[model samples]
Target: AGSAKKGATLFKTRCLQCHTVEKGGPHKVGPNLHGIFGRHSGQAEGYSYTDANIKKNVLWDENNMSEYLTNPKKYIPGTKMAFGGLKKEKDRNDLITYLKKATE
Candidate 1:
């Protein structure tokens, strides 16, 4: 487990530019991330997505999220997300924890 507070900070710096954690928030560079934890990849209506992500169709969970956060491009090749990834495991944990609650 990690600190949600730290994760919130991480989100502001790392993900806020591309994604929004509020429900009904408009899509930015990335799709609005409300309800992200239980959803499948590339499921946001009205948002353009890469073929790689749509085809992936995997449910987002803690395990897969950790892997994806480690390397977004490598985990889902051809994903349009332009993140370099969170190399630190602890940072990933904190971010994921923050997302689990804030995105709900």
Candidate 2:
């Protein structure tokens, strides 16, 4: 799945400033993303989410993850994330795969 097992480096560079990818992982500036798959937005147990993140029901499958990673702001306006979108489709896919594998 695009070497997700090897995607840690990319995730570190791009998203580590914001998110954590393990169960009971330390809280970063953003959310700890363990078991994020199939979870609704802003639903991580201890993380305080933005209005829209908790306002809607959004399952975190590959499709929604693709759109969101492409542009966090565009995908969910008024969300709390500020990182620039991942312009490369390959990077987005690979990073997501990495997240899935690493957090599992």
Candidate 3:
């Protein structure tokens, strides 16, 4: 769980540019990440999402996050998130753990 704090720092550095946790930070370059875990794919409020992403019906649990972290575009084709994807497994795990904690 301590690693989740480190993950929060990592997310700030790596992910916050396009994603927001707080409401109304920015428009949808990427989707708002608050309550992302267990959320349906492409369903962030007040944002229009790609049809491809919406069709995936992904729930953002750990298994899905792991796969998505490996390749965002590959995981959900036509997703607008241009992130090259997290290569390290530990970082992905930590990041998902952090997101789970934050959303709760």
Candidate 4:
């Protein structure tokens, strides 16, 4: 497991502009990521998702999360997610670690 502390910083810099981690947090450009792990893509209520995102029916876990973070467009083709990607494996690990706990 990575450092959730460092991951929280990473998220504040990279993800907070588009997402929220708290329970019942408002959806920004993306959905509030509370309980993101073990949840399917496009499952968040009140968030408008594209058909590509919905049709993919993805499950969020370490492997898929890593892959998607590395390159979202490549992971899910035709999706409208705007962020380029998080290139570092260490950063992704940290971020996912933080997400696992923070989103809980």
Candidate 5:
């Protein structure tokens, strides 16, 4: 089991500042993560994404997202996302699991 519930706890405190992944909800600092797994970078429907994401056309697969979670600025170079990073691989994995389960 991925224990997404555990991830949800961490995400509630950390990710909520940017996201509101309660469902296919709109986010302010970031895009709604519902259906994010198969989404195209910067194309989450309501947010204003940077040119890097618009032009990059990256997919939101687990591996790529893991790298992004490691360091959004490092991964995307000039991302609009305002995060230093998740830092731990365990944390990243747990968030990934939680995101995957949050298919709302």
Candidate 6:
């Protein structure tokens, strides 16, 4: 299925504290990531986004997702996400795969 269960576990352990995916989890800390892939930046419904992100009109494809996971600040400076990023390439890839699965 190309799913990444390990990455899902990693995300749950490390990232979910701030981010969310379910219908209602938290607000304003991080945008709900459900259906994140292929989604335009800062386009989540009912979520208030930073000016920088709102101005960014890119979509979250596999390549972009990989780079963003490697460095959130580098990808979108001034965004509120505090994750340092996955150091290992495999981990990052796995996380991306997992994210795609969760949202689909």
TM-score of each: 0.97, 0.91, 0.88, 0.96, 0.89, 0.86
For every model in order, what is the number of clashing pairs? 0, 0, 0, 0, 0, 0
> Model 1, stretches more than 4 Å misplaced?
none
lDDT of 3 by residue, 1-104 (tens): 33898789988998888787764556647777777877888787788888988899987788888899889899988887788998988898888888787756
lDDT of 1 by residue, 29-78 (tens): 99998888889999988899999999999999988999999999999999
Tens digit per residue, CA lDDT, model 2, 5-32: 4567789888898888877898777989
Backbone clashes, candidate 2: 0
How far out, in Å, is residue 28 in model 2? 1.8
Which segments of model 3 are wrong by more than 4 Å? Answer: 23-28
Better of 1 and 6 by lDDT: 1
lDDT of 2: 0.82
Candidate 6 or 4, higher TM-score:
4
Candidate 2's displacement at residue 20, Å, is 1.2
Q: Cα lDDT of all candidates, in order?
A: 0.93, 0.82, 0.82, 0.92, 0.81, 0.79
The best-first sequence of candidates by lDDT reads 1, 4, 2, 3, 5, 6
Error of 4 at 45 (Å): 0.5
Candidate 6 per-residue lDDT over residues 1-104, each given as its tens digit: 23488888888897787787665555547777887888889888888888878776778898888888888889889977788887888887777788887776
RMSD of each: 0.7, 1.3, 1.8, 0.8, 1.5, 2.0
Model 2 off-target regions past 4 Å? none
Candidate 3 residue-wise lDDT at 93: 84
Error of 4 at 46 (Å): 0.6
Residue 82 in candidate 5, Cα distance off native in Å: 0.9
Task: Give the alpha carbon lDDT tens digit for every residue of 1-104 in model 4.
Answer: 69899999999999999999999899999999998899999899999998888888988897899999999999888888898999999999999999999998
**TM-score-better candidate, 2 vs 4:** 4
The candidates, ranked best first by TM-score, are: 1, 4, 2, 5, 3, 6
Positional deviation of 50 in candidate 4, in angstroms? Answer: 0.9
